[PDB]
Amino acid sequence: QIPVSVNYHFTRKCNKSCGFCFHTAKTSHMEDISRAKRGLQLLQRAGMKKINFAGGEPFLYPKFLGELVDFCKEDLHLESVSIITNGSLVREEWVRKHAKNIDILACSCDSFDENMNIEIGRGTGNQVEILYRIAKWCRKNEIKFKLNTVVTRLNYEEDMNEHIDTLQPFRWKVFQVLIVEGENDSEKTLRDARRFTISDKQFEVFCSKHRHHKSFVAEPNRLMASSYLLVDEYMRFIDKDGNKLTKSILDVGVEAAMKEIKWDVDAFQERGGVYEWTKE
Numbered sequence: 543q544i545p546v547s548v549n550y551h552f553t554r555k556c557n558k559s560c561g562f563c564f565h566t567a568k569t570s571h572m573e574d575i576s577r578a579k580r581g582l583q584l585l586q587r588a589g590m591k592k593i594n595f596a597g598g599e600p601f602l603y604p605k606f607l608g609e610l611v612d613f614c615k616e617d618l619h620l621e622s623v624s625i626i627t628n629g630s631l632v633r634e635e636w637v638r639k640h641a642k643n644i645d646i647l648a649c650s651c652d653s654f655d656e657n658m659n660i661e662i663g664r665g666t667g668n669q670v671e672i673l674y675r676i677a678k679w680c681r682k683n684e685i686k687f688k689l690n691t692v693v694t695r696l697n698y699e700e701d702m703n704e705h706i707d708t709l710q711p712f713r714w715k716v717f718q719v720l721i722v723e724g725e726n727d728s729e730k731t732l733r734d735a736r737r738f739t740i741s742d743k744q745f746e747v748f749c750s751k752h753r754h755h756k757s758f759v760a761e762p763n764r765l766m767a768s769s770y771l772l773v774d775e776y777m778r779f780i781d782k783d784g785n786k787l788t789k790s791i792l793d794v795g796v797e798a799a800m801k802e803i804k805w806d807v808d809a810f811q812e813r814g815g816v817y818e819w820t821k822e
């Protein structure tokens with residue numbers, strides 16, 4: 543298993559409360575910058591070409607984040623450095639200062655109907671304003687702009703083509719709501735995503751309406767369950783499909799930890815996990 547593409551969820555804290563979140567604020571723990579850099583070095587030596595920064599909200603700690611993006615690009619010479627964020631805490635000067643080391647910046651927006659963004663819980667109804675401003679900043683300092691969308695029971699009938707034809711992200715991830723055991727599957731967890739779930743037919747309603755876009759990347763449940771390399775806030779590997787957890791790579795190493803998780807490389811390539819992820 544060559545971990546060519548890794549998501550490092552370095553924090554679990556966030557400033558929003560989307561009802562379907564499958565990566566909840568279980569801990570406020572965060573790794574040290576020496577340990578995180580060592581973990582990113584360990585993954586580089588195992589073959590990782592693309593790092594993606596995620597978790598709760600990465601831009602809750604823009605000093606920690608920016609330190610790691612300059613590290614991954616200047617020191618580890620990673621092919622792709624990417625970030626996924628809800629966009630609200632991004633400051634323009636941070637983008638300007640770190641544009642050279644960022645290949646992709648992804649901002650989440652699940653609807654362009656701000657009432658549904660309130661119903662979802664991603665804020666108080668300004669996500670589209672946040673969204674367009676992030677994309678404006680990306681095109682200024684020449685970062686590839688990417689958009690992530692979660693298709694729920696409240697927005698699968700939504701026609702988004704006017705906005706997609708305007709933003710024109712180079713990459714548009716379209717997730718079906720995923721139920722992850724122990725994260726959002728009941729009322730004993732920090733979120734109850736059961737009200738947002740849709741069927742394979744309801745998902746296809748949204749997909750057929752929008753698949754014509756080149757950026758469009760459809761990610762149904764079967765393509766999301768085990769197609770990812772999930773790195774914990776302790777730098778452990780998460781198997782969210784099987785509800786399992788490894789020891790931190792900092793102690794047992796990359797290759798020994800990877801052997802405990804399931805990673806569907808077949809679904810990884812089906813979802814176009816490998817792509818032209820570099821430049822600026």
Ligand SMILES: Nc1ccn([C@@H]2O[C@H](COP(=O)(O)OP(=O)(O)OP(=O)(O)O)[C@@H](O)[C@H]2O)c(=O)n1
Pocket residue numbers: 547548549564565592594596597624626648690713715720722766767768770771772782783814815
């Ligand atoms: N079972 C899953 C599946 C996905 N994710 C997370 O969902 C997030 C959104 O995915 P995306 O932004 O598409 O991840 P990238 O790795 O950046 O995808 P790509 O490289 O293809 O752009 C990722 O952080 C991933 O870790 C997760 O927590 N649990």
Ligand SMILES: C[S@@+](CC[C@H](N)C(=O)[O-])C[C@H]1O[C@@H](n2cnc3c(N)ncnc32)[C@H](O)[C@@H]1O
Pocket residue numbers: 556562563564565596597598599600626627628648649650690691692717718719720721726735
């Ligand atoms: C968990 S978030 C955290 C990163 C950042 N705060 C953001 O929203 O972009 C990462 C991505 O996963 C998506 N996501 C969260 N919960 C999900 C679920 N249950 N099913 C599918 N996607 C989900 C979010 O919309 C976001 O695009």
Ligand code: SF4
Pocket residue numbers: 556557558559560563564565597598599628664
């Ligand atoms: S999804 Fe909504 S809640 Fe879960 S992390 Fe990203 S922003 Fe915070």
Ligand SMILES: [Cl-]
Pocket residue numbers: 685686687710711712
């Ligand atoms: Cl672009």
